[PDB]
């Protein structure tokens, strides 16, 4: 990021990128231009020798549609918090879930990848109204062990009995929830667990997915040394994985693994495999594959500010009734990109 | 704000805040996350030794809803103007009304307050296409007397006979109008007056409110010394106060009073009372209370860039037919906030 202001113990960092992106696919819903850009600001103030306040905002703007189009810009991150020296930190706002603390180790692909879960999907990705307490080095008991708690308020429907001020469709609603994460150490190990209540609308509107609570168990491994990046994570979810547009999967088992190697002159080829199998689906669907594909691609870094990449996604899904009904794409995609980062 | 550029007699100031805010209320329309942020820029150029040009833009972005939501960002202020040394100043664009010059003395509450009037409501708040002439020290006469003139153009319907390029609903339309303000430091005293024409659609579509002109008379007082802040203002309006969603009140009387004290270590407790009584309403409503509540809260300032506050609004409105039909909330609200200002 570019530090554009540093006075009176307060600093402002401006960051973002402009991505000229194009998709080559046989699926007309994804083929074509995909240009966009990101912009954001990071702040930090020194309250005293052992207390610090900060805030971060991240905003996404799409630029692949006409000037008369609608809903082309949205906010990704917005939160403010405090740091109590080495006793931990606390922040509130729109932030990442604690499950991301483990599932982001495999989210390093050029363009694709990291899509066994969705945004605004309980505590697996960016969410609304999450209060996170993070402690580094586990107070003083041990060294190198990160730890975190989280709590999220209800985000109900647009109107009705379970409504809140920020209503939304059943695909992004949730009740009260909490989560924890635990990472320890170039080999690193991680574990995350989240538990959220399910709204009444999610149990009645969609055809698939019935239950009272949404739970997630995640285990992770990571190797990062000698210009070698190996990472894998296995996740088992309960009434928490979207089965396309048909609802939620009663049981899901996600597994994604990535291998990367960074070359001396800036080339970073990567190979990855992702899968997501649903179980006990209603309507006679039985066990179905929600996602299954192999990702092959590479990235070239001219410097820290400019880069280009090519990403090839080989979709291994088989077209059938479930995929067509749920609107899950089963076509190969090739992505070309040219990114300027500031 | 953060001055990020100062060269060639032109300076740019970047300002804003990130507010992690949560509401605790029994009203489902307001309960839940309320996280948002503001971003804006203030500019000023030195044309010569006695002429100065400037411009200011303010943007509000809501970050309490999902990434697929609509209409989460809007503009609060946008105007450009000139300063003729000490002879006055002129600016045009989207700016505050002259009534705000007196009614802002009571808009100092932590989270609530300043809701006896709405935005885009004639010349009482932020408005479109307002040309404002502001003069300090009242030409060359008595010192300490601030004077202001304003004129606003017509903002008509979306389509039809009285349409303009920027159409809108009857609750935000207006005709040609003007306003004046006058504040003096003696402890401060102020007076404001506005007069606007009412569109034809405003006189036919809503059930309540019939008249040709919108009138507003405002008087205020303020005490700000010795870490004590006292302020109050009384406003009498004619066909200018919204009676919820039912239309406009033929006669309305607004009264606000606020008391605050600033402690040496950073605590700033505040107590305030607000009311708004409507008279001569149609449909047999008679005299109704549009707004009535008591506000108690406090604010803690870590420094000029970080703060947190708690705000408690004790709603004294009584539920009846008018409140339910007009959609006026009658529930207590508790607000918790954590603000980073840059």
């Amino acid at each position: 990021g570019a530090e554009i202001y540093n006075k009176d113990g307060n600093k402002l960092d401006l960051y973002g990128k402009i991505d000229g992106l194009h998709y080559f696919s046989d699926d007309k819903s994804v083929d074509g231009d995909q240009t966009y850009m990101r912009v954001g600001v990071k702040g930090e103030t020194q309250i005293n020798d052992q207390l610090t306040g900060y805030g971060q905002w991240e905003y996404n703007v799409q630029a692949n549609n006409t000037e008369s189009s609608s809903d082309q810009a949205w906010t990704r991150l917005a939160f403010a918090g405090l740091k109590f020296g080495d006793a931990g930190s606390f922040d509130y706002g729109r932030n990442y879930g604690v499950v991301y603390d483990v599932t982001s180790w495999t989210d390093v692909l050029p363009e694709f990848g990291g899509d066994t879960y969705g945004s605004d999907n309980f505590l697996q990705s960016r969410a609304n109204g999450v209060a996170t307490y993070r402690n580094s080095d586990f107070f003083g008991l041990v060294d190198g062990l990160n730890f975190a708690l989280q709590y999220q308020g209800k985000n109900g429907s647009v109107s009705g009995e379970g409504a809140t001020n920020n209503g939304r469709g059943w695909s992004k609603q949730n009740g009260d929830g909490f989560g924890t994460s635990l990472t320890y150490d170039g080999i690193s190990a991680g574990f995350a667990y989240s538990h959220s209540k399910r709204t009444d609308e999610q149990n009645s509107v969609p055809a698939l997915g019935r239950g009272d609570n949404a739970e997630t168990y995640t285990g992770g491994l990571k190797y990062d040394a000698n210009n070698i990046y190996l990472a894998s994570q296995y996740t088992q979810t309960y009434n928490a994985t979207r089965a396309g547009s048909l609802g939620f999967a009663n049981k899901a088992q996600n597994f994604e693994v990535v291998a990367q190697y960074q070359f001396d002159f800036g080339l970073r080829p990567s190979v990855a495999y992702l899968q997501s199998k649903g179980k006990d689906l209603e309507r006679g669907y039985g066990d179905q594959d929600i996602l299954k594909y192999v990702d092959v691609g590479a990235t070239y870094y001219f410097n820290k500010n400019m880069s280009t990449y090519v990403d090839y996604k080989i979709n291994l899904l088989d077209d059938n009734s479930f995929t067509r009904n749920a609107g899950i794409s089963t076509d190969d995609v090739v992505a070309l990109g040219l990114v300027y980062q500031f | 704000g953060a001055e990020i550029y100062n060269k060639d007699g032109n300076k740019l100031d970047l300002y804003g805040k990130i507010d992690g805010l949560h509401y605790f209320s029994d009203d489902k329309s307001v309960d839940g996350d309320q996280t948002y942020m503001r971003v804006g820029v203030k500019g000023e150029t030195q044309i010569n030794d006695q002429l100065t040009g400037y411009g200011q833009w303010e943007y509000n972005v809501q970050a309490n809803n999902t990434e697929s939501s609509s209409d989460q960002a809007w503009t609060r202020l946008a105007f450009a103007g000139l300063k003729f040394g000490d002879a006055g100043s002129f600016d045009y664009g989207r700016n505050y009304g002259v009534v705000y010059d007196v009614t802002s003395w009571t808009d100092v509450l932590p989270e609530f307050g300043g809701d006896t009037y709405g935005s885009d409501n004639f010349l009482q708040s932020r408005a479109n296409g307002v040309a404002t002439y502001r003069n300090s020290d009242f030409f060359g006469l008595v010192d300490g007397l601030n004077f202001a003139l304003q004129y606003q153009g017509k903002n008509g319907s979306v389509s039809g006979e009285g349409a303009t390029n920027n159409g809108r609903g009857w609750s935000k339309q207006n005709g040609d109008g003007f306003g004046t303000s006058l504040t003096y430091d003696i402890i401060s005293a102020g007076f404001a007056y506005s007069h606007s024409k009412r569109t034809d659609e405003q006189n036919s579509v809503p059930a309540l409110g019939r008249g040709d002109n919108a009138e507003t008379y405002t008087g205020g007082l303020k005490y700000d010394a010795n870490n004590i802040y006292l302020a109050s203002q009384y406003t009498q309006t004619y066909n200018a106060t919204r009676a919820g969603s039912l239309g406009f009140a033929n006669k309305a009387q607004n009264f606000e009073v606020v008391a605050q004290y600033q402690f040496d270590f950073g605590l700033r407790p505040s107590v305030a009372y607000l009311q708004s009584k409507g008279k001569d309403l149609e449909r047999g409503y008679g005299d109704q209370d549009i707004l009535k509540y008591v506000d108690v809260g406090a604010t803690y300032y870590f420094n000029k860039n970080m703060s947190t506050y708690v705000d408690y609004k004790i709603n004294l409105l009584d539920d009846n037919s008018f409140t339910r039909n007009a959609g006026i909330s009658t529930d207590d609200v508790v607000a918790l906030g954590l603000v980073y200002q840059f």
């Binding site: 990704r76 990442y96 989210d107 694709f112 990848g113 | -």
Partner: peptide
């Protein structure tokens, strides 16, 4: 509508 990093659809 996808995992946080590179938004899809």
């Amino acid at each position: 509508c996808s995992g946080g990093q590179n938004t899809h659809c």
